[PDB]
Write a protein that binds this ligand. Sequence first.
Ligand SMILES: [Cl-]
Ligand SMILES: [Cl-]
Lengths: 121, 116
Amino acid sequence: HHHMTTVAEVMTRDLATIGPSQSLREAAKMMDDLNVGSLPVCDGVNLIGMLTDRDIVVRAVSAGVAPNERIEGVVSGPPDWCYEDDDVDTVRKKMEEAQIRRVPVVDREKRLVGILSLGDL
Amino acid sequence: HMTTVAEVMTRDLATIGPSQSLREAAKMMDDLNVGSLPVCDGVNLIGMLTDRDIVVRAVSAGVAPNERIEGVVSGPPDWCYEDDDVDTVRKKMEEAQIRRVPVVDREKRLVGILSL
Ligand SMILES: [Cl-]
Ligand SMILES: [Cl-]
């Protein structure tokens, strides 16, 4: 048995992201269509944060921020994130510590390369 | 000895009615640190409105925060009686990935909320 499993071996590489200038309505539609509760917010491979369904509710809806408004005013971080060569068990423990279900994965240049979800484990 | 739902549920009820706004629901979820709220019209338990429901049924449709929540909730809700076995109910909650279940008496009146 050669090695402990790395994030790269279990993450998804089919990346669905949303930009900071897109609307809360667009984020909510993407969450519904993809059946996910959290989206990576990026400009291209440049990771800004993760936006959750609960973030939309407690940071936007509760404050009267309407669906046409841009995501970027609602994003708050710093995001959890990991490197693709990190050990998956260590990352899983950090996800449970933050009570998150998806974590973005970057390469050594901090470019977004994947998403690790609890369901991948 | 079997622990019943009544022994561990919260009896302090904070519910929302169908005529109240999405903003009010979201603010209650934040203030109470919960992901779902019982929707009640008087003694009539209609369903459990989740934070995700607000997003995928209201925000995704462009609904403004001041709009009422009526019709956003979908069901039927999971629910249990106060004298049900809590271990059984929690097994069902784990299976369905729900974190809160409304608890009713034999007349189907809301008496508590079970969390975990
Ligand atoms: Cl989901
Ligand atoms: Cl929560």
